[PDB]
Amino acid sequence: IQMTQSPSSLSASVGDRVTITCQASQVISNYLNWYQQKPGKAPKLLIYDTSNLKTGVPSRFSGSGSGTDFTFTISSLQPEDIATYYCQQYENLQFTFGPGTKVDI
């Protein structure tokens, strides 16, 4: 129906806590994941199942949400966290990615 991700762009100094939102097309029925894609490279998931984080991902990354509204939060921003962040949704046998959130320092 409609999958949105806000904000579209972002600019925050180093050390700031920034949160991003993701709205799924339907009520969540499978794992919701979050990916970090630095310019040029391939995406890399940091958070899976809305809350859990992959082994090796820094502790500053966190996530929460329920239903159709979800959030992605980083506690203390660092210079190598600049990337376009996407949220993944698997509904109706379709993997759909969010518009993405470009964060700048």
């Binding site: 009520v27 969540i28 029925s29 499978n30 794992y31 239903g67």
Partner: protein, 145 residues
């Protein structure tokens, strides 16, 4: 022991109470964690008389990667649950799946006047349990008017 009297066999009723009233997670993601597929267990059914209005209902279709639906074929007596506030339409996949879908808590997949051990294909249900109680003709008429 002698407390209470039963007049006719129609007065004994089986009421199905949804797990939604037990304040458990209604979300389909957490609800899908309560079911699992297992081989070697026969499916059993029990008919009941009354049931609760469900807060969330589910119409799931778990399929093989080839397309084969792993849920059982619903017998004729199985029909959609009567009253649902919201019906989640879910389409899943499970390649390793074997056997038939059962409830991990021991609850029943409530269908219209039927409680089932297995989730049937293409039929709306709700998680719940049933309870045996006696209400005579006059008392039953008062509650439903």
């Amino acid at each position: 022991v002698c407390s209470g009297t039963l007049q006719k066999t129609e007065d004994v009723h089986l009421m199905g109470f949804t797990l939604s009233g037990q304040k458990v997670a209604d979300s389909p993601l957490e609800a899908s964690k309560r079911w699992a597929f297992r081989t070697g267990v026969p499916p059993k059914n029990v008919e009941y008389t009354e049931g609760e209005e469900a807060k969330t209902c589910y119409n799931i279709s778990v399929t093989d990667p080839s397309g084969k639906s792993l849920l059982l074929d619903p017998p004729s007596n199985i029909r959609d649950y009567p009253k649902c506030k919201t019906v989640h339409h879910i389409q899943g996949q499970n390649p390793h799946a074997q056997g038939i879908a059962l409830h991990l808590w021991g609850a029943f997949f409530l269908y219209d006047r039927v409680a089932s051990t297995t989730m049937y294909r293409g039929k709306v249900f709700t998680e719940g349990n049933i309870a045996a109680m006696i209400v005579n003709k006059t008392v039953h008429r008062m509650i439903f008017s």
